Nucleic acid binder design. Sequence first.
RNA 1: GGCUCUUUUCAGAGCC
RNA 2: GGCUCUUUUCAGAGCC
Lengths: 289, 289, 225, 225
Amino acid sequence: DFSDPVYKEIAITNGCINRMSKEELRAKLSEFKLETRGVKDVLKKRLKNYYKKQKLMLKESNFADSYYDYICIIDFEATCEEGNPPEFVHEIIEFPVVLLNTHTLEIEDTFQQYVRPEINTQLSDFCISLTGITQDQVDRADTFPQVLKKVIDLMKLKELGTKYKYSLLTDGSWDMSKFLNIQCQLSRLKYPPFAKKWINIRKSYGNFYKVPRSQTKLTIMLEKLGMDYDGRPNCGLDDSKNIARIAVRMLQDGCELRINEKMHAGQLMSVSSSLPIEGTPPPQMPHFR
Amino acid sequence: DFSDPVYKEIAITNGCINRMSKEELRAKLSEFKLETRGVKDVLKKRLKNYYKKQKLMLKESNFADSYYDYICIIDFEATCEEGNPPEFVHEIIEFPVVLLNTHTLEIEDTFQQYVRPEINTQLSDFCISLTGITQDQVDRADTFPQVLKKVIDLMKLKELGTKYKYSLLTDGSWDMSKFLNIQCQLSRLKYPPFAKKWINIRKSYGNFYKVPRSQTKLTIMLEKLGMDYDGRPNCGLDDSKNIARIAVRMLQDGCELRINEKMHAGQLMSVSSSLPIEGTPPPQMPHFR
Amino acid sequence: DSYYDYICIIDFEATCEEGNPPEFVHEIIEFPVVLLNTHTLEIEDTFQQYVRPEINTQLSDFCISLTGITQDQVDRADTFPQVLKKVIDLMKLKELGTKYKYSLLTDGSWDMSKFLNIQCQLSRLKYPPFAKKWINIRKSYGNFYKVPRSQTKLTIMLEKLGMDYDGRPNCGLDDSKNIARIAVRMLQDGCELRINEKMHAGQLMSVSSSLPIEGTPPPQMPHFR
Amino acid sequence: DSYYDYICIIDFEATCEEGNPPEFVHEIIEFPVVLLNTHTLEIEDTFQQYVRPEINTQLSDFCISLTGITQDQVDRADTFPQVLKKVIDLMKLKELGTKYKYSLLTDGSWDMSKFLNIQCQLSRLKYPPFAKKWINIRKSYGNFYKVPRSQTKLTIMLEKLGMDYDGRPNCGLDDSKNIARIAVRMLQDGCELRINEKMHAGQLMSVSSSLPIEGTPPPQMPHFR
RNA sequence: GGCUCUUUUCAGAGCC
RNA sequence: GGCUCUUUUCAGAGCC
Ligand SMILES: Nc1ncnc2c1ncn2[C@@H]1O[C@H](COP(=O)(O)O)[C@@H](O)[C@H]1O
Ligand SMILES: Nc1ncnc2c1ncn2[C@@H]1O[C@H](COP(=O)(O)O)[C@@H](O)[C@H]1O
Ligand SMILES: Nc1ncnc2c1ncn2[C@@H]1O[C@H](COP(=O)(O)O)[C@@H](O)[C@H]1O
Ligand SMILES: Nc1ncnc2c1ncn2[C@@H]1O[C@H](COP(=O)(O)O)[C@@H](O)[C@H]1O
Ligand SMILES: [Mg+2]
Ligand SMILES: [Mg+2]
Ligand SMILES: [Mg+2]
Ligand SMILES: [Mg+2]
Ligand SMILES: [Mg+2]
Ligand SMILES: [Mg+2]
Ligand SMILES: [Mg+2]
Ligand SMILES: [Mg+2]
């Protein structure tokens, strides 16, 4: 059809090369390590074809790269008691975000905010022992909505969902389906659509490396990849960082980490793998209800 | 659509790799500079994906290649008198074939047969001087039909038209539309359908490199691509070989060498540029009339 | 008296010509930021934004080759004030100047005293008060390792410390990342990097060694002039 | 007495097993041919055909790993007699042994004395007389460059001549093409490659270099034994 | 491990 | 070179 935007870009380039002198051609053509011998016109067409084989090749894989650009790794810590009692109302006490660039495989952003709980405001002895979060840390911390806002501001600033395709990723389903779910209820916030679906890396690991769910714990996933834990275990930010280390390793081994879990009517659901790779909407600070 | 034959290959290799031991996996992994740390199932998935990445990268390799797998270059030499009299009956006296593989860009086959003319059996002084073909050569030579059969035997052996897509390539229109045309009448052979279409390199060179028709002569085309003539000029096989050199340079420059001239009812016509790239039928020795 | 909690590496890329004429009006075309935690010696934040120049809209052939920044990357880019606002938003989110003591660090002095200084005037902005003082890492490196100025070019600094450059030279981010690598190594080696350059009355001045470790005010988006 | 006008380079690939057991019954699975013109040192013809083994139909994982030949490749392949017939038909079209004097060249002795020898028995074919004499290039190389037999492996030969292997190692055609590069270089160096090995009574014998340059008979399809 | 879909079926993608 | 078609129209693809 030729009516594609790329073709108008080639014509300006072709005209740019049609003005190039016989000296300018042999110079530029040598820089691309292409054979320089010939005559005015031969050199002209040769260079014109390279800029055509480059701009159409780059734009071919521009639409072929329909994968996420960012994986957004969050690992909540929340209030808890010894022995995990059934009817204890959980509250998020650490909101850590590790933002992973899928192309460069480098962590572009690490962000840690603490959260002040308002139901069970005093932390458990067991809880502080596990998470490594002192009472003083939560006392001086902001409320969950203020923290979520700040997390969304960081996401908007990095232009997730607007300029860059992205998905959230967590170790297990707990983070979104349990902790955030309970928290939004408690904070009387509408559950944010941007967190309505995510990547459970345990399902992703188990499927990709062929291991049982019992083997898909954070410390075991690391061990099976021949690496140890970096930082302090059960510390949200440090957890998120090690989860990111697994993600990288998986991405390197060719695993396209895709969304496999979602929320819907308060129920945890599985997302079809055969379904086309869709990105998460741009984050919005939810309204009170 | 995993229906592509490439996928059955990957299935065969994956099972081959599934059989590999921890050591064999660690070995072949070091051999590709890929990470070697991990566990059996990790190393297994990593290496399996490497062969997947490799095969798919390789099978989508359509740059500096043609849609034809082979290009079969023929430059007849025929009996001639000095001054090229209008009514002298031409007879092919040299049948060179230079078979060019379009992916490897190497000449896979060169083949040269001399032909005993039966009309003007005695060659001219000019003809001998021009072509460099002695009377002794044509005297020992076979009849054109016999030579054509041999040429076809070569094409059948290299699986042209059956396993591989191919086309004939000629410097000018003369070889097919005139020399073979006249020769077939004389030898009382039906014109062979495999030679009804072909690539005219002069047409191709003319509107690829934007040069006039008067500047698309063999010696000029080469001198323009920054190369001198290899071997003896006006000698079929050497002509063909130098033609093949132009053909390569053009495919490298990214010219989709396409059939541009057919022949219909003894009349030379051009094949449409817009028509789908079509391949020559498998060659058959034509019958007598 | 405590050290900085964060070092904030900035290496601008600017519009330019072949031969680097002296009187040239530069416009920022890339605004990278690398946030280094001084306690853990780890890069916490990486932020790169291209900047659309308003005066000299078309990048020269030389500029495109030097930086690697293409014309189109510039066209789709925000203008400077919008880019700066974003960079400040990040620093605010990281609580630099409020909760954590910080400094800006540049490879040389032009980044703040020339590029930022000029670019503000062109964008009709007051000069950001938080950017009045910074660590010149070439001044630190030159004083700590006792080498002349001639031997403080980014690539030479890396070689002397047994390093190869990571990525594309003259790409702002890759530069900042590499400068951060020198920053990390120098902190490891024992040089407690401190602010050693400032601007006063638009004049480039030195900051004294014996002057105590003072932080930089929390970033604010400057008002229009 | 004139020199060979053509040299045929043949490097068979055959079924095999880890450790290379001594009593293993090899079956040719690839039949490459490279026609080198000794006057011009140009390659004039290359013919590659995969051979379908009748006894060991299923290629071992080790064989697939080494040669690069897949099961599918040998499945869709003709049997040895058909491949051989095709190779001779190519040789007859080139008029080898009738118009042009020619020789066979192999990288070692096994190709002809073992692979072809055993395969012909398994294909119930008499041994083609034209293939009873050949140039062992390792023998030539060893005698011309004065190196032990151990130093004549394909890789080493190229390495000592300033060459890297060209293509996939152990892909018969690629080995032939690389052997051709050695045969070219040696002819350029001044070593006129002579037939130096023979099959007589089915047992491998050396051809004296004192003996005159003699042509290989024009090739014929051997009859069924 | 248990299952389920798929001419990547000596294989692939998922689920509890 | 003379032409002829094409929002690749500072350009593309042909034709005698
Ligand atoms: N062994 C445990 N007992 C009780 N609660 C736990 C336990 N492990 C994790 N949790 C809860 O899960 C949260 C974070 O889990 P994780 O992201 O797996 O570190 C903690 O803040 C706890 O509230
Ligand atoms: N100058 C010429 N005079 C007469 N016949 C020629 C001339 N050039 C080419 N031919 C004829 O065309 C045949 C092939 O030459 P070419 O077409 O140049 O490949 C020759 O065998 C001649 O019969
Ligand atoms: N060799 C040079 N010639 C002209 N301008 C330069 C040169 N090197 C650096 N610059 C300018 O300085 C900016 C960044 O400098 P630096 O951080 O030293 O790479 C570039 O974006 C250019 O505008
Ligand atoms: N290392 C090896 N192990 C087992 N068989 C081999 C080995 N090298 C060569 N062969 C056999 O010899 C044939 C030809 O190899 P080459 O001698 O390299 O031309 C191969 O197809 C194998 O069957
Ligand atoms: Mg967790
Ligand atoms: Mg955790
Ligand atoms: Mg001709
Ligand atoms: Mg000719
Ligand atoms: Mg700089
Ligand atoms: Mg720079
Ligand atoms: Mg061999
Ligand atoms: Mg071999």
